[PDB]
Amino acid sequence: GQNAQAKMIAAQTAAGRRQAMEIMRQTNIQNADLSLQARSKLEEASAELTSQNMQKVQAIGSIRAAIGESMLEGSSMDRIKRVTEGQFIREANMVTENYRRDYQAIFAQQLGGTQSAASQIDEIYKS
Amino acid sequence: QDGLINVRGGQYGRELIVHINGKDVAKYKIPDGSQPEHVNNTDAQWLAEE
Amino acid sequence: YAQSFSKLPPNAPNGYMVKIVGDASKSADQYYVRYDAERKVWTETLGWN
């Protein structure tokens, strides 16, 4: 039955082609979820950095209030606030950098998944 | 006078509708996601442009 | 008019203005913030009109 063999093999072309199409659908959908997770991480970083900003308002405010009633002024009295403002800037720089590391990890995971899907599609095609 | 449409991202198989002044001005259907070419279709900036 | 502070988009036109009105029934959380394109920061500023 040559026709039977052709029908069976045609089913293999159907099996591999839909299997490969599904590999792309699953890999493409996972990547979208990772992108949404990265966006949510960005939003969380923004919220925590805003909290850091609000704490800074009260912190630098107190420095100005105390250094304002001291009756001394000068260079050392400005170095007190300058060093404090710097600590807040560096702390925010860390929130902004921890986010970059997380995004890089997501990027690497997405590339790994895409490469795996590519290799699987090659395997399916090679039959 | 004006507004904004923040685009967090694109998910495959969903539909996007913008309703302004009682009119569904924008209607887009993201493909299922089997073709790799749909990366642009799900991209945030490409979707915003569309 | 954006209810919560986190609802603001991460990026926006330089001159955009948004009001928080957190509660919608109390005057405790009413303030305006405008975006800053070059600095990529939403700056609290005086309200419109």
Side-chain angles (χ1 to χ4, degrees):
Chain A
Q2 314 98 60
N3 290 316
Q5 186 186 359
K7 277 288 134 185
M8 293 180 183
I9 298 299
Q12 307 313 140
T13 295
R17 77 190 178 191
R18 63 205 51 192
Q19 174 188 344
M21 290 273 173
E22 187 60 21
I23 279 157
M24 198 44 48
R25 275 174 286 181
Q26 296 289 353
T27 307
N28 290 5
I29 291 159
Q30 172 184 180
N31 286 2
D33 283 338
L34 272 298
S35 64
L36 266 293
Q37 286 188 6
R39 195 46 177 263
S40 300
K41 210 158 296 306
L42 194 162
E43 311 266 10
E44 187 275 330
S46 183
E48 64 184 0
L49 196 153
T50 314
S51 165
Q52 298 212 4
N53 290 121
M54 290 179 71
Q55 300 340 284
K56 191 176 64 57
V57 173
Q58 206 173 18
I60 302 307
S62 176
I63 295 289
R64 267 198 295 276
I67 301 272
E69 299 180 348
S70 41
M71 204 179 58
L72 294 165
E73 311 185 349
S75 180
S76 292
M77 292 306 164
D78 73 37
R79 200 254 178 180
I80 288 167
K81 196 199 309 177
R82 198 58 54 180
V83 170
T84 300
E85 292 171 354
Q87 293 162 13
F88 284 99
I89 292 157
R90 289 186 296 90
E91 281 293 341
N93 289 330
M94 303 213 293
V95 158
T96 41
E97 180 278 348
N98 187 12
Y99 169 74
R100 204 61 211 161
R101 284 183 282 122
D102 274 334
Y103 173 53
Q104 284 173 350
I106 290 168
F107 204 94
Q109 185 176 2
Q110 282 185 333
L111 277 296
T114 313
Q115 294 287 334
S116 78
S119 175
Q120 291 158 267
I121 296 166
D122 272 358
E123 201 256 340
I124 293 167
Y125 163 72
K126 204 202 161 183
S127 65
Chain B
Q1 191 68 23
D2 44 347
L4 288 164
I5 297 169
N6 188 359
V7 174
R8 300 165 39 82
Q11 179 74 326
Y12 293 63
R14 313 314 294 123
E15 183 161 9
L16 276 76
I17 310 179
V18 175
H19 195 78
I20 188 75
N21 285 321
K23 314 213 76 193
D24 279 4
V25 296
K27 174 173 282 321
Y28 186 79
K29 263 296 308 193
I30 299 169
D32 57 337
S34 66
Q35 320 286 301
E37 284 77 13
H38 310 316
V39 65
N40 267 350
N41 291 330
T42 183
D43 192 11
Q45 295 298 109
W46 185 103
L47 211 53
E49 289 279 16
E50 180 56 38
Chain C
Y1 306 95
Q3 184 198 354
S4 184
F5 184 80
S6 57
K7 296 288 199 313
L8 309 184
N11 206 357
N14 205 0
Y16 207 60
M17 199 86 62
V18 186
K19 189 180 192 181
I20 308 314
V21 64
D23 186 75
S25 186
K26 298 180 188 294
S27 53
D29 200 28
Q30 309 257 37
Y31 62 93
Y32 310 83
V33 297
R34 74 161 151 201
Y35 192 69
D36 199 27
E38 61 266 350
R39 284 173 39 70
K40 305 291 174 322
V41 173
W42 291 84
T43 305
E44 186 185 0
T45 61
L46 183 62
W48 59 66
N49 199 351

